[model samples]
Every structure is written in structure tokens, then in C-alpha cells.
Target: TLDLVNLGVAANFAILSKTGITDVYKSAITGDVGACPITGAAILLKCDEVTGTIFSVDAAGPACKITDASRCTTAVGDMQIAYDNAAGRLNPDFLNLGAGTIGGKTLTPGLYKWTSTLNIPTDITISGSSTDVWIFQVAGNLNMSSAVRITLAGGAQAKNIFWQTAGAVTLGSTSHFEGNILSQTGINMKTAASINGRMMAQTAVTLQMNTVTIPQ
Candidate 1:
């Protein structure tokens, strides 16, 4: 006996085109056309608790997990170094670099080579005032030559910092930092340094040789 049937199908198949992987369900659900482009591909996926992005997969094999996210804002205009008075939120163009001046400022995402010394009196934030995601996307070394302090002021949480290049992140012997550090190459601490946040890098991360405190 032979049976023939005609039925509508709605199978969401993730195309496998990377080192060793298959369709990214989240990407597919979000209409993301960027698929893995290599055979035997592997991918890192995580449930975006904040975005409610989830995937369902069950197999006996190596699992791919998204360790963290990079949400550093690339929009310089969306960032303000300090919250001012008078006109409410002031534009960050008033940022000035000099010998002994504390100014709220932001640097456009790029390979910016510092020619003069920049003195930030307060904490240096990384992104916009809103809760939107952003990327710092640094390509060169960030030379911290002063005993300055780096902190995120606004109630914004831009935890996405992708150091996608190769270089060394050098800090002054006594520089004080207050935010997460994500480096692609390596991080070096000259002397008794202090970091009040997490440090993520491609290579080794060095810390202070003395007592150090961190944020909550």
C-alpha cells in the first residue's frame, strides 16, 4: 500500500555555514540575515534576559555559550561626560584637555592617539544617557599616563567593550579606575594600581601587588 499526503510545513531550520554549527535561532527569530559562513562552525548563544531572546536546542555535543555582551555606545553625540546645571544636560563639545582641569568629555570610537595630556577631574563615562546599547570598539592602546580616575556616572549600564585588535593597555603606576576593562591584546599594571571594576582581556590581566577594592 502507498500513501500520499500534502501538508503545509513551518520548519525553522538554522543553516550551518560556519566552523561547526547550525542556525542561530535568536538571529532567525529577529530576522537577522547574518548567518554562520563556515562549515563545521560554532556559535555562542545566550538568553538575553533584558531582551527576552531565547533558543531551544537539545543535543549530545559541545555547547556554545555567549559569555557576555559588548554594549559600548559608538555615538559620541549620545554621550555626555558630566551632567551640568543651567541648561539641564549640556552637550559634550565643551570638553577641554589641559594641564589641571576637570572636564566631562568623551572620545569618538576609533584609534585615537593622544598627543597632549588629558586630565579628567571626575569619573569618565563611556556612553549615552539612555539605556541603549553601545560599543567603545577601541583599536589601539589606551595609554593611561595620569593618576586619573575612570568612572561611569549616569545610571546607564554600557558593559560592552570590544577590544578587537592587538596591542598593549598600559596604565600609570598609580592610576585609579572604576569601570570594567575589556582588552583584546593585553593589560599591564606598572606599579601599585587600583581597579574598582572587572577586567576582561584577550591576554593576561595584571592587578595590584597590594590590597585592592572592587565595586558591587
Candidate 2:
């Protein structure tokens, strides 16, 4: 808390260096393959089934898989750093926005904080310049309705947008999200949920028939 500079993106190497995604269409990787649901404890990444990919924007990059316990711990180590740097900081610019029902609206760049659960029942637009930053500090779960879209407007880049949530982050079926999601808890994606940025969770990351691509 005392060390994070830039309010956001200060400890983003963990996010930018490695990205996470699962594909029931192909495959995804993280913590466990099929361990019993930890009603208690936590993990980094879990996919019961994967038929997709781990694509990176870098031309000479990683197309990967994780069955190794040590590597999982290694990545998970840096993952926690990025999460703490973003989630531990307080963002008070836009507080309790739309009562955590942010949808069908246009948003400007700033630090938005909501102490309650968040739901996006419709499409939303984030309008801002490329260099401008948007950090959403959510204290509760973040849920998106099925078939929702988070569109970027103007020069807004998905890289500059950050969603730092304390609870589980869920994207509904066929919903498309664009931004870095730094969750202190689990990140669950329903069927066909796609993301343009990275997902770094302190807990497990569950994906089903999803597309996770690093933002350009």
C-alpha cells in the first residue's frame, strides 16, 4: 500500500508478462485439472476441460501448457504481486457508481470504487484517450449479464483499463470484456466469454469455452 506508484500499472509486469485463458474448445491452464472444489482454500488457475489456446500478442512468444507444480507456483507468485499492487490501493474518484449496475452507459477515465457487488446487465462504453487510465476498485463480486459487451471508445486502449475486484469476477455467456482484471478472488467465465486483456486472480481462474487475448 505504501509502495504502489502510478495508482495503477505500477506492478503490471506480472500481468503483461504472462496472460491466462482456458478453452473447453481446446484447453486452458492454471492450478488444478480436476481436484475437488475447494469449498475452503484457494488456487491460481483451474480448468476441468480445455480445447482452445493460450495465445500471446508477441510474435515469438509462448503457446503453453501447465502440468508442472513448480511452474504454477512460480507464475502464481508474480500474480499475487500484480494483484496486491492494484487491489490494495484505494480508488475514490467515482464511488458506488450506478450502485454496481454499470451498463448501458458511457464512462470516463478515473478511479471508480464500489463497496458493493457489481453487475453489468447491458453493453457499456468507456470513452477516453489512449494514455488515460481507468481503475475500478470493486469490493464485492462482479457479474455481467449474458451477451454483454464492454466496448472501448475514442483512443481508449484495453491495457489502460483495470478492474481490481475483491470478490469473484464472472462474465456471462457470450459476453465480451476488454480490460485487465485483477481479482483478489476467483475469476469465472461462462461459455464463450471473451476478454481482450489479461486476468490475474489470487484465487482460481475458471473458464469455459472462452477467448482470452492480450490487448493491442
Candidate 3:
């Protein structure tokens, strides 16, 4: 099993994409963002500001939205390494929770895996100490409904939670999500959605009027 302890400073990134475009609109990202290899589609308008660095593999590519494009290669490479490490956790502490419908449930620290889709239709609670970890492995899409929330308790920290999805991931409008989302495909954050974790997608990452902050 892989723990977040190995991610090092790369874990501070709030957003990362591989080949697909990272499209942001009126969103505020409080940590670093980057894309790799193919980075010609990261559409960053002037209104969308990132608190940390922005980078891409191609210094002259369209996805290289920041003024200092020299850092693109390293950041993008680190993202891929983090994604692979997170996705390769083989030993799971728990398996097939609610057949992937994990709403309204209070969870503990463990590795949770699901072969099907995972949905959060309501609020979910995670209770644990700051040192405890929760890894969610979803083989299919991970979806969160509008206004849904994932709350932490008992000193739990967002930095210890990981959501590894093999398919696309979507957060509904106004939803509050907490975890390091490592998606195999795209990750879409709807209007007003908030995340207290990272969004690392193998493909594209789309955001609109959202707030993404890396946990301290």
C-alpha cells in the first residue's frame, strides 16, 4: 500500500493534468497547477488566478499559462509520479463499501475500494486522527451531488484522504469535497464547488467558479 508520506512537496499541488486540457473559469486555486507532455489546451482566462505556480511540459505551449514557463517540465513530471504511486496501492483495508454509493456514512481510516461507480448523494463524515489515512479506490466514475459535503471530524485532516478513481470524476454544483483526487480521466468541478485537496487528473480538469485549496 502507498501512503501520502511519499508524495513530498508535490502533494501541495491543487491541480494537475496529463494530456488533456485544464480549463478554468473564474476559479481560485490556492496551490500549484500543472500539465504534462501535451499541454496545448489549458485555457486560463485572466480572471482565473492561481495562488501558486502554473506550468506545462511545453514552455511555449498554450497550456503554459504562467509567465515563468521554465518550471513546467519538472512540475508535470512530478505529477505523473504522484499519480502512479497513488494508483498502485494494492493492499486495501476495506472493500466495496455500499457498492460505491458512500453517502450518509461515517467512515474510518482505511483503504476503501469499489469496482463500480461511486456516488455521494448526501453528506459523508470521516472520523480519525490527523495521522490516520483514508484511501478510496474507485474503478469507475466518482460523482458528488449538488451541495453534498465530506466533513472531517476527530482531528482528521484533508491531507490524509485520497480518492483514486479509474474513470472520470465530477463534483456537482456547490459541493464541498475533501481529498486528493487522482483521476484516470477528467475531473470536473461545477459552479461554486469547493475542494480542500488536490485534483490530479490523467486527462483534463475542468473548473468553473470553484475554490480549490491545498490542505496545510
Candidate 4:
């Protein structure tokens, strides 16, 4: 759903939204979304693990997990780069739509900025085109209530959305999110949580019976 004009701009977002064809219901694994957590004797990363594989942002990257290095050298390094990039672009076109506690609201393409925790107690929608971009910058943690879904409308592709936070990111059990998560800390995806974007956390990514997919 991305074009060369955007991709060729030589942005920190090198590639993650560029993939295709993957099975659902049981797809897991990644490019050092650290399929491998580093540190003493710990595995660096294991791509295409038992659960199955998803389209790496590079179409050949998620599985690009470091088979031997440690967590991920390039993948993790790349995440850090994009994380910085997203943080640098904090110009908000729509300022704090919900004052941090968002739910029952609809968002569109633009730079969104908010202070403190962003709690979604209900469902929300992001309406935009595949080409339009939405960058959501948060000064604190992000919490999406359980079973809460971030729906997309007007052909909005999750890949075109960015969720940048300074603290931890949490998707409550069974909640569905739609954005490329760029957290400064860790990400906790409770049991059965689903995402239509990438989880490029600066720290840990805790998944529990979760479903994470590369954006279309």
C-alpha cells in the first residue's frame, strides 16, 4: 500500500511495511522483534518459529531475525533508528484528541501529540488514505483496554500510522491495535491481543497468545 515516492525519500523508516502474503490465526515470530532476547546464554532471535511466520517489513526481514548474533543487530538497530525518527517528528496537527484518555473517538491523518498516558477504554477509528500519514506522539505510556479495537477506515493502512510513546505500551487482553508501535520502553501484549502493524519496541515485547501482523 506504499509508493516509491515515500519509500525512496530515504527515511529512517527504511522498510517494515513492504511485505505480502501470510497466513493468519496462528502467525507469530519476527525480525528481532527479538524473537531473541539477548543476555547470558539467551537466544539472540529465532525467526519463523513454531507458530509460523509473517511477512517481514522487508518481505524478507522479519524472518531477518538474527539466527545467531543476539536478539538482532540490524533489526534492533533499525528499530532504534526509526524510534528516534518518530520521536523527532512530534509536530501535532491534531493535539490530544482525547486528552490522553481516548475512546469513542475517530482520528484522521495528521501528526497527533498528547501528554501523559493514552488510555483507550473504548473502540476508536483512524480514517485516512493509504498514502496519507498519521504520526501519534505520546509523552507517556499507552494503554488500550481489553477487546478494544482500533479500526481503520477510508482505505487507511496501518503501515502509514505511527504510535510513538516515551513509556511502555500495553495492549490489553484481546485488544486490537492499528499502528506501527514505536515505544521507548517495553510493549506488553496480553493474551490474544492482535495488531495490524509492527511492534518496534526499544525494550522488551511481551506477547501472550497474541497475533501480530505486518501492515498491508
Which candidate's lDDT is highest? 3
In what order do the candidates fall by lDDT, top score first? 3, 2, 4, 1
Two-way lDDT contest, 2 vs 3, winner: 3
RMSD of model 4, in Å? 7.0
Which pairs of residues clash in candidate 3, taking residues 3 or more apart in a chain or in different chains?
none
Against the reference, the lDDT scores of all candidates come to: 0.32, 0.63, 0.77, 0.62
Give all candidate RMSDs, comma-separated: 17.1, 7.5, 2.7, 7.0
lDDT minimum window of 10 residues, candidate 4: 13-22
Please give the distance, in angstroms, between residue 4's alpha carbon in candidate 4 and its true position after superposition: 11
Rate residue 164 of model 2 by lDDT. 84
After superposition, which runs of candidate 3 have C-alpha atoms over 4 Å from their true positions? 20-24, 59-71
List the lowest-lDDT window of 10 residues for candidate 1.
2-11
For candidate 2, the lDDT comes to 0.63
- Global local distance difference test of model 3: 0.77
What tens digits encode model 4's per-residue C-alpha lDDT throughout 1-216? Answer: 212112221122211221111223343543223322343122222345423322222213344332433223455556667777777773568777777787898887777788778899999998877688888888899999899999999988876888889998888989998877877877777878888777665555666767766665
Q: Compared with the true structure, what per-residue lDDT tens digits does model 2 show for residues 51-165?
A: 3232233222233432333334454565557666666666367888898798898999787888899999999999988887888888899999899999999998887888888
Best by TM-score: 3
